Amino acid sequence: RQLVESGGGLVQPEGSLTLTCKASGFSFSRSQYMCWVRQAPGKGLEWITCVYPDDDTPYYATWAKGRFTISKTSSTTVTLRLTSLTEADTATYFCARTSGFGGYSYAAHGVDLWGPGTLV
Amino acid sequence: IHLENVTEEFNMWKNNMVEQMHTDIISLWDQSLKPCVKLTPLCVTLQCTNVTNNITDDMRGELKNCSFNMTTELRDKKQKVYSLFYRLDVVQIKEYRLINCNTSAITQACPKVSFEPIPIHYCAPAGFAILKCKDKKFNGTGPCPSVSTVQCTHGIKPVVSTQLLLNGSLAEEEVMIRSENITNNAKNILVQFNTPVQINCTRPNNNTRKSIRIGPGQWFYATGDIIGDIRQAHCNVSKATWNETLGKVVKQLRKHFGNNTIIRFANSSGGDLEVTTHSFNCGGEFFYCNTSGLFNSTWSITLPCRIKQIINMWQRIGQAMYAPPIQGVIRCVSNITGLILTRDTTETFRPGGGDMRDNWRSELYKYKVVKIEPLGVAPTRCKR
Amino acid sequence: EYRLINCNTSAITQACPKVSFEPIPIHYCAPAGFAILKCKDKKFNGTGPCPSV
Amino acid sequence: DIVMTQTPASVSEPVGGTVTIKCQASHNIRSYLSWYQQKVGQPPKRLIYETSNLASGVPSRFAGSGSGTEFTLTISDLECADAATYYCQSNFGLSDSRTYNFGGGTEVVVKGD
Ligand SMILES: *[C@@H]1O[C@H](CO)[C@@H](O[C@@H]2O[C@H](CO)[C@@H](O[C@@H]3O[C@H](CO)[C@@H](O)[C@H](O)[C@@H]3O)[C@H](O)[C@H]2NC(C)=O)[C@H](O)[C@H]1NC(C)=O
Ligand SMILES: *[C@@H]1O[C@H](CO)[C@@H](O[C@@H]2O[C@H](CO)[C@@H](O)[C@H](O)[C@H]2NC(C)=O)[C@H](O)[C@H]1NC(C)=O
Ligand SMILES: *[C@@H]1O[C@H](CO)[C@@H](O[C@@H]2O[C@H](CO)[C@@H](O)[C@H](O)[C@H]2NC(C)=O)[C@H](O)[C@H]1NC(C)=O
Ligand SMILES: *[C@@H]1O[C@H](CO)[C@@H](O[C@@H]2O[C@H](CO)[C@@H](O)[C@H](O)[C@H]2NC(C)=O)[C@H](O)[C@H]1NC(C)=O
Ligand SMILES: *[C@@H]1O[C@H](CO)[C@@H](O[C@@H]2O[C@H](CO)[C@@H](O)[C@H](O)[C@H]2NC(C)=O)[C@H](O)[C@H]1NC(C)=O
Ligand SMILES: *[C@@H]1O[C@H](CO)[C@@H](O[C@@H]2O[C@H](CO)[C@@H](O)[C@H](O)[C@H]2NC(C)=O)[C@H](O)[C@H]1NC(C)=O
Ligand SMILES: *[C@@H]1O[C@H](CO)[C@@H](O[C@@H]2O[C@H](CO)[C@@H](O)[C@H](O)[C@H]2NC(C)=O)[C@H](O)[C@H]1NC(C)=O
Ligand SMILES: *[C@@H]1O[C@H](CO)[C@@H](O)[C@H](O)[C@H]1NC(C)=O
Ligand SMILES: *[C@@H]1O[C@H](CO)[C@@H](O)[C@H](O)[C@H]1NC(C)=O
Ligand SMILES: *[C@@H]1O[C@H](CO)[C@@H](O)[C@H](O)[C@H]1NC(C)=O
Ligand SMILES: *[C@@H]1O[C@H](CO)[C@@H](O)[C@H](O)[C@H]1NC(C)=O
Ligand SMILES: *[C@@H]1O[C@H](CO)[C@@H](O)[C@H](O)[C@H]1NC(C)=O
Ligand SMILES: *[C@@H]1O[C@H](CO)[C@@H](O)[C@H](O)[C@H]1NC(C)=O
Ligand SMILES: *[C@@H]1O[C@H](CO)[C@@H](O)[C@H](O)[C@H]1NC(C)=O
Ligand SMILES: *[C@@H]1O[C@H](CO)[C@@H](O)[C@H](O)[C@H]1NC(C)=O
Ligand SMILES: *[C@@H]1O[C@H](CO)[C@@H](O)[C@H](O)[C@H]1NC(C)=O
Ligand SMILES: *[C@@H]1O[C@H](CO)[C@@H](O)[C@H](O)[C@H]1NC(C)=O
């Protein structure tokens, strides 16, 4: 059970790209919540967005709302579409899965599984 | 008035007092719904969303937002009204309809009327008397000595439930197992505990009642805008007590089925929620709880619950009652005093029941109605 | 734009035009086992004792 | 909308010592906070999943506590192997605004000979 990212490579300013992440070894289910986080090479980590696979509700950071789109594409994959790219967005992007409680957010435990990050 | 040498014959399975109580409850219930608002105008197309802005995940699929067009005047001037609904009350045709608009009239329970059980005593009319057994360890059938007379029965609360028997009364010494036909798997077994199991139930959601004008002097009660986190309703059942209670039941079942066998408890069976789940309505709202967490053994327990607003009272079809929402939160505590069980070497028992009369039959097993006929003759010394 | 005054609070029923409510003096009569007593006094309070019952 | 501040941004302590790491939230987060340890080139490892409750496989040296808006770690018996960037993650949830702000982190340097 390992998340694996693809779709890396840097794209010039004002371009766009889409990142892909696969659930190798597992399928998405109600206890799992999927998110993306990025880390610029000289920075800490910044949360971008999450999606809940049973109804595909996206959640976004304010700073990301007009540029990032998260969507489920299969029972094993999710993607993140990034637009209006700037050089300031160069970062390692990670696909991650959280867990939690039925009585309070299946995310309220944080990330149990991270993929290798991919840089763009 | 203890009757010193009276040995009278009883049969709880043929007790017409149970039949009367059933009929009386239904009649009172029905007449209370003659006044107050009829909800025909709600049988409209609803446009619903999934209500996800403040929820725990176990509640994620439970509520619908449901916007619709309803009016207050015959002005062809409808207004948008929205109300949250529980999923169980709404059926898909994005477009939805209320579940009962396909088969029945919907009547709003009148919000000022309470059905909270008050113990009721039944009293004999002139010319009649009620007799009762005082014996401990009584079958509920057959003869019993120590018969006494009753003008009025002890009070019995008209509590209506499924699977578990709530409140009412306890057995004198040991859990009693009573049945009409014990070797017949087609019959229910009524088990009366000699000690209660305490159960705590709640609806931990601070709700809001929304008053909607529906007509000229008529109001509809909508619900919505729940304050704070939305959480699942549940019951806690003390765990140690439950386990001990089953041990007592098992011992008594063995006296009837053999002390050399093994029995188990299964999570009931299939069918409608009115059959498969535990049902009660404390606080004014109707709860359906999963007893699979209790009947799981071979010889605190949180039970998840669901809530419905549109209720087809068990006793009939063609009509449905709409329970208005209750403002604030609901909490209640009750005593489980018994079980309604069926049986499928070893043996398996399952929660059953659903027939409202079993909840009264279990109390009215001590009383019998007789007619007084105070006239007779005998040979003697008595000449005009 | 106007509405009828009671369409905001109540049902409106038409009096049936063939039915009259014109007052006719009504006498009340006692059921068996009962009797009605009355005062014949002039200048009676409507309360308290009275002779000539 | 809920943002968390770390302090000290960086520390340095000799092997065998103990580091206190503090995280201050802008809002009460009902003790749902998690903590992570990040090695260079790796995704962060979860140490704590719920305020004080340690993730499976994590030594007791990484225990911590807090309530309300104030949370800390006290990592004992520091080894050079424990030098890492430590991070505070909010996990508040419920609302549709969510925003699981990952707070900042602190750098812990463990000094040898
Ligand atoms: C078994 O018996 C118990 C005890 O009689 C029943 O619970 C009781 O239900 C009443 C009615 O809901 C509760 O009182 C209510 O309190 C609210 C508070 O604001 C008030 O507004 C109502 O007018 C009423 O006073 C009572 O507290 C409650 N008892 C406990 C301990 O909570 C129980 O419901 C019975 N079982 C069944 C299935 O009915
Ligand atoms: C159910 O849906 C309605 C319709 O969208 C939601 O109510 C709206 O909430 C926004 C929030 O500011 C208001 O601006 C709108 O005016 C509201 N609509 C109306 C008709 O008042 C409502 O909150 C939803 N209920 C939930 C999710 O509990
Ligand atoms: C409300 O939530 C339920 C799930 O809780 C949604 O159900 C999904 O419906 C789509 C329709 O194609 C299915 O593919 C999904 O598998 C369903 N989810 C599950 C878990 O079964 C439902 O669509 C949601 N309704 C709205 C209005 O968004
Ligand atoms: C309430 O009535 C209005 C008026 O008819 C409905 O709005 C119309 O919906 C149809 C559906 O396709 C549209 O084609 C019309 O253009 C809409 N009219 C207007 C003025 O917007 C409205 O949807 C009804 N409400 C609900 C919940 O069905
Ligand atoms: C969902 O519940 C949360 C928790 O009660 C509400 O968040 C609070 O809203 C009040 C309103 O002024 C704020 O002052 C608090 O600071 C909020 N809490 C936090 C942690 O920020 C939230 O508004 C509710 N959402 C809806 C749609 O009602
Ligand atoms: C139902 O709730 C009541 C309180 O509302 C619980 O009663 C408490 O039980 C503990 C058990 O040791 C006692 O120490 C407390 O003093 C009790 N509270 C009061 C106010 O007396 C009761 O146990 C709950 N039942 C279940 C099954 O959880
Ligand atoms: C649940 O059972 C307990 C006893 O196990 C009941 O306690 C009774 O409470 C009344 C209140 O005044 C006392 O007068 C009785 O003497 C108590 N009984 C005993 C045996 O002490 C409790 O009321 C029961 N709850 C319900 C809802 O019936
Ligand atoms: C509509 O009523 C009929 C009555 O027999 C019932 O069978 C049917 O299932 C109802 N519709 C839905 C969607 O349940
Ligand atoms: C009590 O129930 C058992 C069940 O088998 C029955 O055999 C017995 O005769 C019953 N006793 C009386 C007095 O009816
Ligand atoms: C149960 O019913 C069957 C039906 O024939 C009968 O034979 C049997 O004896 C009954 N059991 C008891 C204990 O009466
Ligand atoms: C059940 O027990 C849990 C234990 O914390 C408690 O929080 C919950 O409110 C209880 N529910 C009821 C109905 O007592
Ligand atoms: C009993 O538990 C099993 C476990 O899989 C479940 O499938 C079954 O439906 C349950 N029975 C009822 C009546 O819920
Ligand atoms: C009862 O709990 C069991 C546990 O798995 C679950 O499968 C079942 O569907 C539940 N039934 C109801 C009616 O909630
Ligand atoms: C029955 O008990 C077993 C024992 O572990 C448990 O795994 C199972 O889930 C239980 N069934 C229910 C319905 O809780
Ligand atoms: C529900 O929220 C309102 C908001 O002020 C509060 O006044 C009320 O007491 C709350 N009800 C409960 C049962 O907590
Ligand atoms: C409409 O009915 C309400 C009922 O309280 C009354 O107060 C109100 O004045 C009525 N409207 C008008 C215009 O009188
Ligand atoms: C007549 O009314 C007056 C009023 O003050 C009262 O004092 C007087 O006692 C009344 N007489 C009788 C007979 O009740």
JSON list of N, CA, C and O and ligand atoms in Angstrom, two decimals, chain A residues 30 52-57 72, chain B residues 48-52 57 59-64 87 92 94 96, ligand 3:
[
{"chain": "A", "resi": 30, "resn": "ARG", "atom": "N", "xyz": [-14.29, 4.89, 2.42]},
{"chain": "A", "resi": 30, "resn": "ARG", "atom": "CA", "xyz": [-14.81, 5.93, 3.30]},
{"chain": "A", "resi": 30, "resn": "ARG", "atom": "C", "xyz": [-13.90, 6.36, 4.45]},
{"chain": "A", "resi": 30, "resn": "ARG", "atom": "O", "xyz": [-14.04, 7.47, 4.96]},
{"chain": "A", "resi": 52, "resn": "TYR", "atom": "N", "xyz": [-12.59, 14.09, -0.51]},
{"chain": "A", "resi": 52, "resn": "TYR", "atom": "CA", "xyz": [-13.14, 12.91, 0.14]},
{"chain": "A", "resi": 52, "resn": "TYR", "atom": "C", "xyz": [-13.79, 12.01, -0.92]},
{"chain": "A", "resi": 52, "resn": "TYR", "atom": "O", "xyz": [-14.86, 12.36, -1.42]},
{"chain": "A", "resi": 53, "resn": "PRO", "atom": "N", "xyz": [-13.26, 10.80, -1.17]},
{"chain": "A", "resi": 53, "resn": "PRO", "atom": "CA", "xyz": [-13.62, 9.90, -2.26]},
{"chain": "A", "resi": 53, "resn": "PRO", "atom": "C", "xyz": [-15.05, 9.37, -2.32]},
{"chain": "A", "resi": 53, "resn": "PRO", "atom": "O", "xyz": [-15.49, 8.96, -3.39]},
{"chain": "A", "resi": 54, "resn": "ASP", "atom": "N", "xyz": [-15.80, 9.37, -1.23]},
{"chain": "A", "resi": 54, "resn": "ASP", "atom": "CA", "xyz": [-17.16, 8.88, -1.38]},
{"chain": "A", "resi": 54, "resn": "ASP", "atom": "C", "xyz": [-18.12, 9.89, -1.98]},
{"chain": "A", "resi": 54, "resn": "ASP", "atom": "O", "xyz": [-19.25, 9.53, -2.33]},
{"chain": "A", "resi": 55, "resn": "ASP", "atom": "N", "xyz": [-17.75, 11.16, -2.06]},
{"chain": "A", "resi": 55, "resn": "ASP", "atom": "CA", "xyz": [-18.70, 12.09, -2.63]},
{"chain": "A", "resi": 55, "resn": "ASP", "atom": "C", "xyz": [-17.93, 13.12, -3.39]},
{"chain": "A", "resi": 55, "resn": "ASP", "atom": "O", "xyz": [-18.50, 14.02, -4.02]},
{"chain": "A", "resi": 56, "resn": "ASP", "atom": "N", "xyz": [-16.64, 12.92, -3.39]},
{"chain": "A", "resi": 56, "resn": "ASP", "atom": "CA", "xyz": [-15.65, 13.72, -4.06]},
{"chain": "A", "resi": 56, "resn": "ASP", "atom": "C", "xyz": [-15.70, 15.19, -3.68]},
{"chain": "A", "resi": 56, "resn": "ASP", "atom": "O", "xyz": [-15.38, 16.03, -4.51]},
{"chain": "A", "resi": 57, "resn": "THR", "atom": "N", "xyz": [-16.00, 15.51, -2.42]},
{"chain": "A", "resi": 57, "resn": "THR", "atom": "CA", "xyz": [-16.00, 16.91, -2.07]},
{"chain": "A", "resi": 57, "resn": "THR", "atom": "C", "xyz": [-14.59, 17.42, -1.93]},
{"chain": "A", "resi": 57, "resn": "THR", "atom": "O", "xyz": [-13.81, 16.82, -1.19]},
{"chain": "A", "resi": 72, "resn": "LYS", "atom": "N", "xyz": [-10.95, 13.24, -8.19]},
{"chain": "A", "resi": 72, "resn": "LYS", "atom": "CA", "xyz": [-10.76, 11.80, -8.21]},
{"chain": "A", "resi": 72, "resn": "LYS", "atom": "C", "xyz": [-10.95, 11.33, -9.64]},
{"chain": "A", "resi": 72, "resn": "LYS", "atom": "O", "xyz": [-11.90, 11.75, -10.29]},
{"chain": "B", "resi": 48, "resn": "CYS", "atom": "N", "xyz": [-32.54, 18.48, -3.73]},
{"chain": "B", "resi": 48, "resn": "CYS", "atom": "CA", "xyz": [-31.75, 18.26, -2.53]},
{"chain": "B", "resi": 48, "resn": "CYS", "atom": "C", "xyz": [-30.25, 18.18, -2.79]},
{"chain": "B", "resi": 48, "resn": "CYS", "atom": "O", "xyz": [-29.81, 17.71, -3.83]},
{"chain": "B", "resi": 49, "resn": "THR", "atom": "N", "xyz": [-29.48, 18.61, -1.78]},
{"chain": "B", "resi": 49, "resn": "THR", "atom": "CA", "xyz": [-28.02, 18.54, -1.73]},
{"chain": "B", "resi": 49, "resn": "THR", "atom": "C", "xyz": [-27.67, 17.75, -0.47]},
{"chain": "B", "resi": 49, "resn": "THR", "atom": "O", "xyz": [-28.56, 17.44, 0.31]},
{"chain": "B", "resi": 50, "resn": "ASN", "atom": "N", "xyz": [-26.38, 17.46, -0.24]},
{"chain": "B", "resi": 50, "resn": "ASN", "atom": "CA", "xyz": [-26.03, 16.53, 0.84]},
{"chain": "B", "resi": 50, "resn": "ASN", "atom": "C", "xyz": [-25.68, 17.12, 2.21]},
{"chain": "B", "resi": 50, "resn": "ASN", "atom": "O", "xyz": [-25.21, 16.39, 3.07]},
{"chain": "B", "resi": 51, "resn": "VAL", "atom": "N", "xyz": [-25.89, 18.40, 2.46]},
{"chain": "B", "resi": 51, "resn": "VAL", "atom": "CA", "xyz": [-25.66, 18.93, 3.82]},
{"chain": "B", "resi": 51, "resn": "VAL", "atom": "C", "xyz": [-24.32, 18.56, 4.44]},
{"chain": "B", "resi": 51, "resn": "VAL", "atom": "O", "xyz": [-24.28, 17.83, 5.43]},
{"chain": "B", "resi": 52, "resn": "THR", "atom": "N", "xyz": [-23.23, 19.10, 3.94]},
{"chain": "B", "resi": 52, "resn": "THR", "atom": "CA", "xyz": [-21.92, 18.73, 4.46]},
{"chain": "B", "resi": 52, "resn": "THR", "atom": "C", "xyz": [-21.08, 19.81, 5.14]},
{"chain": "B", "resi": 52, "resn": "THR", "atom": "O", "xyz": [-19.87, 19.65, 5.26]},
{"chain": "B", "resi": 57, "resn": "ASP", "atom": "N", "xyz": [-17.94, 12.21, 9.95]},
{"chain": "B", "resi": 57, "resn": "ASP", "atom": "CA", "xyz": [-18.13, 11.43, 8.74]},
{"chain": "B", "resi": 57, "resn": "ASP", "atom": "C", "xyz": [-19.17, 10.37, 8.83]},
{"chain": "B", "resi": 57, "resn": "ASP", "atom": "O", "xyz": [-19.85, 10.09, 7.84]},
{"chain": "B", "resi": 59, "resn": "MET", "atom": "N", "xyz": [-22.00, 10.71, 9.76]},
{"chain": "B", "resi": 59, "resn": "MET", "atom": "CA", "xyz": [-23.26, 11.36, 9.43]},
{"chain": "B", "resi": 59, "resn": "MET", "atom": "C", "xyz": [-23.30, 11.88, 8.03]},
{"chain": "B", "resi": 59, "resn": "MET", "atom": "O", "xyz": [-24.27, 12.53, 7.63]},
{"chain": "B", "resi": 60, "resn": "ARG", "atom": "N", "xyz": [-22.26, 11.63, 7.26]},
{"chain": "B", "resi": 60, "resn": "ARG", "atom": "CA", "xyz": [-22.16, 12.23, 5.95]},
{"chain": "B", "resi": 60, "resn": "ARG", "atom": "C", "xyz": [-23.29, 11.97, 5.00]},
{"chain": "B", "resi": 60, "resn": "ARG", "atom": "O", "xyz": [-23.61, 12.85, 4.22]},
{"chain": "B", "resi": 61, "resn": "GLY", "atom": "N", "xyz": [-23.88, 10.81, 5.01]},
{"chain": "B", "resi": 61, "resn": "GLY", "atom": "CA", "xyz": [-24.97, 10.57, 4.08]},
{"chain": "B", "resi": 61, "resn": "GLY", "atom": "C", "xyz": [-26.36, 10.71, 4.70]},
{"chain": "B", "resi": 61, "resn": "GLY", "atom": "O", "xyz": [-27.34, 10.35, 4.07]},
{"chain": "B", "resi": 62, "resn": "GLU", "atom": "N", "xyz": [-26.46, 11.18, 5.94]},
{"chain": "B", "resi": 62, "resn": "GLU", "atom": "CA", "xyz": [-27.75, 11.19, 6.61]},
{"chain": "B", "resi": 62, "resn": "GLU", "atom": "C", "xyz": [-28.69, 12.35, 6.34]},
{"chain": "B", "resi": 62, "resn": "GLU", "atom": "O", "xyz": [-29.89, 12.19, 6.55]},
{"chain": "B", "resi": 63, "resn": "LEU", "atom": "N", "xyz": [-28.20, 13.52, 5.97]},
{"chain": "B", "resi": 63, "resn": "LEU", "atom": "CA", "xyz": [-29.13, 14.64, 5.80]},
{"chain": "B", "resi": 63, "resn": "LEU", "atom": "C", "xyz": [-29.21, 15.17, 4.39]},
{"chain": "B", "resi": 63, "resn": "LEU", "atom": "O", "xyz": [-28.23, 15.26, 3.67]},
{"chain": "B", "resi": 64, "resn": "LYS", "atom": "N", "xyz": [-30.41, 15.59, 4.01]},
{"chain": "B", "resi": 64, "resn": "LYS", "atom": "CA", "xyz": [-30.65, 16.21, 2.72]},
{"chain": "B", "resi": 64, "resn": "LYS", "atom": "C", "xyz": [-31.10, 17.65, 2.92]},
{"chain": "B", "resi": 64, "resn": "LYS", "atom": "O", "xyz": [-31.82, 17.93, 3.87]},
{"chain": "B", "resi": 87, "resn": "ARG", "atom": "N", "xyz": [-32.32, 11.23, 5.53]},
{"chain": "B", "resi": 87, "resn": "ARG", "atom": "CA", "xyz": [-32.32, 10.41, 4.34]},
{"chain": "B", "resi": 87, "resn": "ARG", "atom": "C", "xyz": [-33.43, 9.40, 4.30]},
{"chain": "B", "resi": 87, "resn": "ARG", "atom": "O", "xyz": [-33.99, 9.14, 3.25]},
{"chain": "B", "resi": 92, "resn": "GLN", "atom": "N", "xyz": [-35.34, 9.27, -3.98]},
{"chain": "B", "resi": 92, "resn": "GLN", "atom": "CA", "xyz": [-35.03, 9.86, -5.27]},
{"chain": "B", "resi": 92, "resn": "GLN", "atom": "C", "xyz": [-36.03, 9.50, -6.32]},
{"chain": "B", "resi": 92, "resn": "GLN", "atom": "O", "xyz": [-36.49, 8.37, -6.40]},
{"chain": "B", "resi": 94, "resn": "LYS", "atom": "N", "xyz": [-31.06, 14.33, -8.40]},
{"chain": "B", "resi": 94, "resn": "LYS", "atom": "CA", "xyz": [-31.16, 15.60, -7.70]},
{"chain": "B", "resi": 94, "resn": "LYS", "atom": "C", "xyz": [-32.58, 15.87, -7.26]},
{"chain": "B", "resi": 94, "resn": "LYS", "atom": "O", "xyz": [-32.81, 16.55, -6.26]},
{"chain": "B", "resi": 96, "resn": "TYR", "atom": "N", "xyz": [-36.05, 14.80, -5.74]},
{"chain": "B", "resi": 96, "resn": "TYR", "atom": "CA", "xyz": [-36.55, 13.91, -4.70]},
{"chain": "B", "resi": 96, "resn": "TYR", "atom": "C", "xyz": [-37.98, 14.16, -4.30]},
{"chain": "B", "resi": 96, "resn": "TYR", "atom": "O", "xyz": [-38.54, 15.22, -4.56]},
{"chain": "E", "resi": 3, "resn": "LIG", "atom": "C1", "xyz": [-24.65, 12.33, -1.27]},
{"chain": "E", "resi": 3, "resn": "LIG", "atom": "O1", "xyz": [-23.63, 11.34, -0.68]},
{"chain": "E", "resi": 3, "resn": "LIG", "atom": "C2", "xyz": [-23.75, 10.06, -1.28]},
{"chain": "E", "resi": 3, "resn": "LIG", "atom": "C3", "xyz": [-22.75, 9.18, -0.59]},
{"chain": "E", "resi": 3, "resn": "LIG", "atom": "O2", "xyz": [-22.72, 9.39, 0.81]},
{"chain": "E", "resi": 3, "resn": "LIG", "atom": "C4", "xyz": [-23.48, 10.19, -2.81]},
{"chain": "E", "resi": 3, "resn": "LIG", "atom": "O3", "xyz": [-23.56, 8.89, -3.38]},
{"chain": "E", "resi": 3, "resn": "LIG", "atom": "C5", "xyz": [-22.69, 8.68, -4.49]},
{"chain": "E", "resi": 3, "resn": "LIG", "atom": "O4", "xyz": [-23.50, 8.75, -5.81]},
{"chain": "E", "resi": 3, "resn": "LIG", "atom": "C6", "xyz": [-22.65, 8.55, -6.94]},
{"chain": "E", "resi": 3, "resn": "LIG", "atom": "C7", "xyz": [-23.51, 8.65, -8.17]},
{"chain": "E", "resi": 3, "resn": "LIG", "atom": "O5", "xyz": [-22.85, 8.11, -9.31]},
{"chain": "E", "resi": 3, "resn": "LIG", "atom": "C8", "xyz": [-21.99, 7.15, -6.81]},
{"chain": "E", "resi": 3, "resn": "LIG", "atom": "O6", "xyz": [-21.14, 6.92, -7.89]},
{"chain": "E", "resi": 3, "resn": "LIG", "atom": "C9", "xyz": [-21.15, 7.08, -5.49]},
{"chain": "E", "resi": 3, "resn": "LIG", "atom": "O7", "xyz": [-20.49, 5.80, -5.32]},
{"chain": "E", "resi": 3, "resn": "LIG", "atom": "C10", "xyz": [-22.06, 7.33, -4.35]},
{"chain": "E", "resi": 3, "resn": "LIG", "atom": "N1", "xyz": [-21.30, 7.22, -3.12]},
{"chain": "E", "resi": 3, "resn": "LIG", "atom": "C11", "xyz": [-21.40, 6.15, -2.35]},
{"chain": "E", "resi": 3, "resn": "LIG", "atom": "C12", "xyz": [-20.56, 6.10, -1.12]},
{"chain": "E", "resi": 3, "resn": "LIG", "atom": "O8", "xyz": [-22.15, 5.22, -2.65]},
{"chain": "E", "resi": 3, "resn": "LIG", "atom": "C13", "xyz": [-24.57, 11.15, -3.40]},
{"chain": "E", "resi": 3, "resn": "LIG", "atom": "O9", "xyz": [-24.40, 11.34, -4.83]},
{"chain": "E", "resi": 3, "resn": "LIG", "atom": "C14", "xyz": [-24.44, 12.46, -2.74]},
{"chain": "E", "resi": 3, "resn": "LIG", "atom": "N2", "xyz": [-25.46, 13.36, -3.26]},
{"chain": "E", "resi": 3, "resn": "LIG", "atom": "C15", "xyz": [-25.15, 14.53, -3.74]},
{"chain": "E", "resi": 3, "resn": "LIG", "atom": "C16", "xyz": [-26.31, 15.41, -4.11]},
{"chain": "E", "resi": 3, "resn": "LIG", "atom": "O10", "xyz": [-23.98, 14.90, -3.88]}
]
